[PDB]
Amino acid sequence: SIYQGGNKLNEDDFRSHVYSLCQLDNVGVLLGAGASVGCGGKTMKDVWKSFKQNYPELLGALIDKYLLVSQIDSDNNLVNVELLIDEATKFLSVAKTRRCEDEEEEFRKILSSLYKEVTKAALLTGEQFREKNQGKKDAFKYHKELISKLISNRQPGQSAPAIFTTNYDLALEWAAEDLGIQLFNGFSGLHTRQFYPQNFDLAFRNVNGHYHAYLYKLHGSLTWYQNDSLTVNEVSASQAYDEYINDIINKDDFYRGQHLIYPGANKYSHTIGFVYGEMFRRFGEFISKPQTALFINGFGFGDYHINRIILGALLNPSFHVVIYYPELKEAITKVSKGGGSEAEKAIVTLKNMAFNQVTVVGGGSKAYFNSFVEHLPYPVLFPDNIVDELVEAIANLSK
Amino acid sequence: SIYQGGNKLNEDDFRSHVYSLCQLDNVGVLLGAGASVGCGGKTMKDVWKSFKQNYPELLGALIDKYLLVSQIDSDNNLVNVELLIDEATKFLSVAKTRRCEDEEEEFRKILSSLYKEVTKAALLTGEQFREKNQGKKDAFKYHKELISKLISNRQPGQSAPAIFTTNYDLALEWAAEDLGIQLFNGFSGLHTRQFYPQNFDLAFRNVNAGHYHAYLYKLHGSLTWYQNDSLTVNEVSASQAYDEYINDIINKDDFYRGQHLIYPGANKYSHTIGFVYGEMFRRFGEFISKPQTALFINGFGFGDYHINRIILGALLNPSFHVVIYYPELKEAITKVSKGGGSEAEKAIVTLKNMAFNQVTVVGGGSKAYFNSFVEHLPYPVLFPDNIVDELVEAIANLSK
Amino acid sequence: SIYQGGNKLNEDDFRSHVYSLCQLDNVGVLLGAGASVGCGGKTMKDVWKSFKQNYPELLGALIDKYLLVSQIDSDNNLVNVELLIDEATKFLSVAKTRRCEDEEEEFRKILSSLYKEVTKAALLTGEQFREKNQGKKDAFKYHKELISKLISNRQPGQSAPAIFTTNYDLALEWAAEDLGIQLFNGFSGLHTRQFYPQNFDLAFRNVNHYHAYLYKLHGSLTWYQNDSLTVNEVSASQAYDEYINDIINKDDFYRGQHLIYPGANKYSHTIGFVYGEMFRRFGEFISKPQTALFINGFGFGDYHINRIILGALLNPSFHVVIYYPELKEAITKVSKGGGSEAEKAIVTLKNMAFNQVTVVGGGSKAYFNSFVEHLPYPIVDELVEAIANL
Numbered sequence A: 001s002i003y004q005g006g007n008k009l010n011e012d013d014f015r016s017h018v019y020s021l022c023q024l025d026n027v028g029v030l031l032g033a034g035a036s037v038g039c040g041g042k043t044m045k046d047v048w049k050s051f052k053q054n055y056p057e058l059l060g061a062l063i064d065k066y067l068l069v070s071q072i073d074s075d076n077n078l079v080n081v082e083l084l085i086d087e088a089t090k091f092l093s094v095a096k097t098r099r100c101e102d103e104e105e106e107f108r109k110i111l112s113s114l115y116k117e118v119t120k121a122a123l124l125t126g127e128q129f130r131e132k133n134q135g136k137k138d139a140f141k142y143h144k145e146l147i148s149k150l151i152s153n154r155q156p157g158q159s160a161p162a163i164f165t166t167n168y169d170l171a172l173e174w175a176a177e178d179l180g181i182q183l184f185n186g187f188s189g190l191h192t193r194q195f196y197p198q199n200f201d202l203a204f205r206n207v208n209g210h211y212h213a214y215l216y217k218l219h220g221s222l223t224w225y226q227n228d229s230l231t232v233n234e235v236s237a238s239q240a241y242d243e244y245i246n247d248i249i250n251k252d253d254f255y256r257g258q259h260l261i262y263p264g265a266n267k268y269s270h271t272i273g274f275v276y277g278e279m280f281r282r283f284g285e286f287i288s289k290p291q292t293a294l295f296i297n298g299f300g301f302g303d304y305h306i307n308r309i310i311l312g313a314l315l316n317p318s319f320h321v322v323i324y325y326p327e328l329k330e331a332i333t334k335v336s337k338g339g340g341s342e343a344e345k346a347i348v349t350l351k352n353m354a355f356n357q358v359t360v361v362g363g364g365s366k367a368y369f370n371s372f373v374e375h376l377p378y379p380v381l382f383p384d385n386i387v388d389e390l391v392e393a394i395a396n397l398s399k
Numbered sequence B: 001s002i003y004q005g006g007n008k009l010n011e012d013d014f015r016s017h018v019y020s021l022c023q024l025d026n027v028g029v030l031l032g033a034g035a036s037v038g039c040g041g042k043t044m045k046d047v048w049k050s051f052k053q054n055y056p057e058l059l060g061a062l063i064d065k066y067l068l069v070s071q072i073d074s075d076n077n078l079v080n081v082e083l084l085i086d087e088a089t090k091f092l093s094v095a096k097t098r099r100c101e102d103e104e105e106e107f108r109k110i111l112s113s114l115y116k117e118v119t120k121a122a123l124l125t126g127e128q129f130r131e132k133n134q135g136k137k138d139a140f141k142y143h144k145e146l147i148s149k150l151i152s153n154r155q156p157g158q159s160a161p162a163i164f165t166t167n168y169d170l171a172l173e174w175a176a177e178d179l180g181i182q183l184f185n186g187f188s189g190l191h192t193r194q195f196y197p198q199n200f201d202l203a204f205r206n207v208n209a210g211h212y213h214a215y216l217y218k219l220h221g222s223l224t225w226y227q228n229d230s231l232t233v234n235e236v237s238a239s240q241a242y243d244e245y246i247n248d249i250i251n252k253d254d255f256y257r258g259q260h261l262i263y264p265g266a267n268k269y270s271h272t273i274g275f276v277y278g279e280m281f282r283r284f285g286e287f288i289s290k291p292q293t294a295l296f297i298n299g300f301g302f303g304d305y306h307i308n309r310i311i312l313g314a315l316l317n318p319s320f321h322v323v324i325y326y327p328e329l330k331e332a333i334t335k336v337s338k339g340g341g342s343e344a345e346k347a348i349v350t351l352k353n354m355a356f357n358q359v360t361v362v363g364g365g366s367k368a369y370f371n372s373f374v375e376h377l378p379y380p381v382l383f384p385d386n387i388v389d390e391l392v393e394a395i396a397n398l399s400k
Numbered sequence C: 001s002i003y004q005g006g007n008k009l010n011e012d013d014f015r016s017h018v019y020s021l022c023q024l025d026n027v028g029v030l031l032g033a034g035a036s037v038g039c040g041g042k043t044m045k046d047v048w049k050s051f052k053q054n055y056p057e058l059l060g061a062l063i064d065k066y067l068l069v070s071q072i073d074s075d076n077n078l079v080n081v082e083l084l085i086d087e088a089t090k091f092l093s094v095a096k097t098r099r100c101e102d103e104e105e106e107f108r109k110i111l112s113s114l115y116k117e118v119t120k121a122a123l124l125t126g127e128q129f130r131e132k133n134q135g136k137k138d139a140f141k142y143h144k145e146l147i148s149k150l151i152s153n154r155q156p157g158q159s160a161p162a163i164f165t166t167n168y169d170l171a172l173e174w175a176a177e178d179l180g181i182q183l184f185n186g187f188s189g190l191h192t193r194q195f196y197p198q199n200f201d202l203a204f205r206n207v208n209h210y211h212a213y214l215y216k217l218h219g220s221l222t223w224y225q226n227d228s229l230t231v232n233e234v235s236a237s238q239a240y241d242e243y244i245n246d247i248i249n250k251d252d253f254y255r256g257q258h259l260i261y262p263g264a265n266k267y268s269h270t271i272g273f274v275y276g277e278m279f280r281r282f283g284e285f286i287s288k289p290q291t292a293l294f295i296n297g298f299g300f301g302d303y304h305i306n307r308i309i310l311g312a313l314l315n316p317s318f319h320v321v322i323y324y325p326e327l328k329e330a331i332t333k334v335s336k337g338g339g340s341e342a343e344k345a346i347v348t349l350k351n352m353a354f355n356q357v358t359v360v361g362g363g364s365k366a367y368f369n370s371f372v373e374h375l376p377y378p379i380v381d382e383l384v385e386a387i388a389n390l
């Protein structure tokens, strides 16, 4: 269930290790798309089912004329969405050069439908997306505990925690604004909010309140748009819903560059994108510094970039990592049978190393977001220890 | 029924935490109108009960014509005094603007008939208000104990304790004058006492090194303060105050003309002649924005907007600890579970559900009274070997 | 006329004195409603005249039945509307509580008309109010200079400049945003903004870039109190889509205790708390040592600001500079028997025998624009265009 360096580890020692791992100089987390399942989110598996059910006509064309997907994989619902986008874009680009009008519309329809399906699963509240004070609900009660535990475990003279994510939903912002705390994401201004890369080096100070954190979104957001003027703007949720989200969801018009996101395999296709590179540079720079700990939850290991970056970080004798993977036993069994997908071989390789700096936690339902939040400890405000634990010695001498 | 951070803890851990808190850089306390119940005071509910009995026709007119209070709200004892006073003042002002005649005098009578109950309930002793040695009785023992416990625990090179209150009575001055302690109030002189804001930074000093003193802040004025036409604040003794201007209030009727400085109102910013009220709150705000600070609250009912806001906004510091006493706690949770309850019943339950270790809430009914509050305070240890007795700790207890 | 406590000095002495004042520890700038006329602002006189000439049918009722407008002041255009709105709201609340059905609908018309007249003179851009980068226009040019130089004067290790304004229009925010400088106004968040008073003591510092404070005395067009008992804030576009557009382009509709401008709802603690906070912060700043305050665009028509300014003059290190143009006319009016209490208060400061007060009067001598270019002084476009060519 719990492995450290290829061996087996118990529970009490695991808790003691986790407690000691939160006292280092740098602590950070990385949250995937499975972390927001309890708040009302979806998963890429359900997107395929929704697309298949809602659009029964385009699937036939895709499987018949263009041979972009196999029949058995479609029936089993085990197809990769992040890969079909690249093939569809390549097909669209090839046809547009030779002036073939019939194929362009048929591929634009597929792209518009798939993008419409993707965006709808990030609202988390349906039509209630345009209301206010959504952070007071009971669903967003564990994010608040996570933030409180991450920030309360700090000593004066240390650095602030950092949070990395690969989602689009506005759960972290709502949870943080509920408690009245401020997060920094490189934006500033109210009426005209822009992106300034140098706003990541600013911290609070008392002239005569010391509670803040950073937040990096590695794949954009649902409220960021570009006007092609080499600038990026951010607006509120109700403003965005009134502007373009409602039209995209309901009017079923053709998709354009209303909002910038990165669904796909090759992230370098967007040449004029200068945000993605900046965020990944900050991630890589944060990793390299010594005396660092990192907790990973909700990640499916389906990205070449991230799991290629992680592997090279273990040559530093000051980097510790904790990885949660629910369905570990199935992957272990299936790799020995001949092999499986590329996502599972990576996690199997990590488990089998011989360094005492990698820990993998499995166990199905007990390696979820709630359990991960529960494992984090509370600080001890006031540290005799010479007789305090010796009082119970009299009690246990009463056999 | 003791909670911190949403969890629960026992008595021994609570007492150890209380002992730990008392030896910080700064220590303070905040009292309310519930702490004077044991000394002979009364709450606003008794004030309303007396008013409804003593003025039948005024209540009837209010119910029938002016419609300020509904028939169902009054009988079940759920009315409010601050909002009623504010609404009556607004109605009087609009009546004056409309140049009315009967409404003006009727609302003047209504307003003048209300301050009498407050002044009557603020005496704590009755006819013996203008007498000497009032602190020698047995009704002020616990206040003396609290003052002694607060003063004794301090170490050389630290800051003097501070006390805040929202009362009109003199339960603290009588107790402090019996022991010989010299409180600093913000006044000077004997034959003419004036409010100088610059005296809040003065400390005693002996040429050969009495050493015991403390500060007192009254947030809502006092019963012994009157403002002259020269925009000055003067303080007198109890005997002179009783003799000159407060005797006529009880015996006679309709003779209230800004005689004493009190704020029974929900909002005080509309009143634009009071600057001491803004003076005390600056010190209160400055006190709770310093590192290594602790604060105890007892007798407060969370009925003030400004205090609630300033307390809530002060929890963002990482070196602030607070203890709150609130006797009827289970009922508030039960009423909130249905989504209802008053705003006061919601402010307390919101605080209890925080995820920080820097907040503590105590309930239990009769276990969270003023008498029990003083008992939890620890006596200092003088000479401490304390390292060899811990060896004997196991030996001493050998029953079986 | 340019007099310094009753004496006269050349321009060089004035420049040296203002330079010495600008080299103090604490500085502050106070602006009134007269500062907005440089880009499309309006004064009380013009709006009152327009209301008189547009709705004369209900002015007689306001005088005969309610007794709200002084006839002599109305003819002389010497009436305050800010107090009138507050008393109208009080009257409406009293009528609603008393359950007077006939009288309840009467005050809706006057309140709607007053709010329609008020909001027409605060957009400053008309129908283009909901666009972006509106601070880039040439109209908001001297505001950039004022803010930039005020920030530039401050030396390292000292405090930050403060700005007090009575206008309730989005004027300084555009200039601050387009300049590239952050300002703190006691609000935080993006999706749901709330008012936290304790934000006026924060600062920035690079771990390996300054700011300024703004105090809106009477609120703004964006601050509004929703159904919940909390104070919020919205952007210009959202407010325009929500309520600003309707009240200007609708027949008759009134919500009630919803909006928090201009200094209107002071009878509610939830709404009066912010006003009290601004008053307290102003008073606290005024009563600090070695402070210099610059006044401009204020008509001295308030019974509260004048007295609190007068009381603070006890300290020998509190300098006040006033910019009131019509000084010689004031002297001529004072010469005869007739006079006004406001102008008597204004001319009282000229009876001082110490070199701290300096009153500037005349024509262009004391204007909000001219006041801007009195403080001392402290490409990319070509490259941007070259890049934009592709």
Ligand SMILES: Nc1ncnc2c1ncn2[C@@H]1O[C@H](COP(=O)(O)OP(=O)(O)OC[C@H]2O[C@H](O)[C@H](O)[C@@H]2O)[C@@H](O)[C@H]1O
Pocket (backbone or CB within 6 Å): A032, A033, A034, A035, A037, A038, A043, A044, A045, A082, A166, A167, A219, A262, A263, A264, A297, A298, A299, A300, A301, A302, A303, A326, A327, A367, A368, A369
């Ligand atoms: N309740 C739960 N709590 C935690 N983890 C869970 C839970 N339920 C399932 N899981 C695990 O959550 C995981 C679900 O994996 P998926 O979200 O499809 O893969 P990814 O995270 O790489 O996709 C993120 C995409 O978002 C970007 O836009 C890019 O397109 C990324 O590819 C499995 O391990 C489940 O067992």
Ligand SMILES: Nc1ncnc2c1ncn2[C@@H]1O[C@H](COP(=O)(O)OP(=O)(O)OC[C@H]2O[C@H](O)[C@H](O)[C@@H]2O)[C@@H](O)[C@H]1O
Pocket (backbone or CB within 6 Å): B032, B033, B034, B035, B037, B038, B042, B043, B044, B045, B166, B167, B298, B299, B300, B301, B302, B303, B304, B326, B327, B328, B368, B369, B370, B371
């Ligand atoms: N024996 C007791 N010992 C301690 N506390 C007690 C006791 N009995 C009751 N309490 C608590 O004492 C508290 C007071 O009951 P509340 O009805 O809020 O008092 P008020 O209405 O007279 O005015 C209270 C303040 O609110 C106003 O705005 C003014 O600022 C007043 O100062 C409750 O928690 C009681 O349970």
Ligand SMILES: Nc1ncnc2c1ncn2[C@@H]1O[C@H](COP(=O)(O)OP(=O)(O)OC[C@H]2O[C@H](O)[C@H](O)[C@@H]2O)[C@@H](O)[C@H]1O
Pocket (backbone or CB within 6 Å): C031, C032, C033, C034, C035, C037, C043, C044, C080, C081, C082, C083, C166, C297, C298, C299, C300, C301, C302, C325, C366, C367, C368
């Ligand atoms: N270009 C100009 N240059 C100089 N002064 C000017 C200019 N244009 C106008 N003025 C002067 O600007 C002045 C405008 O005076 P008022 O608008 O009454 O002052 P406030 O609103 O700031 O005062 C606030 C109070 O007003 C409310 O009623 C409440 O009582 C508020 O508390 C006149 O003297 C003009 O000559």
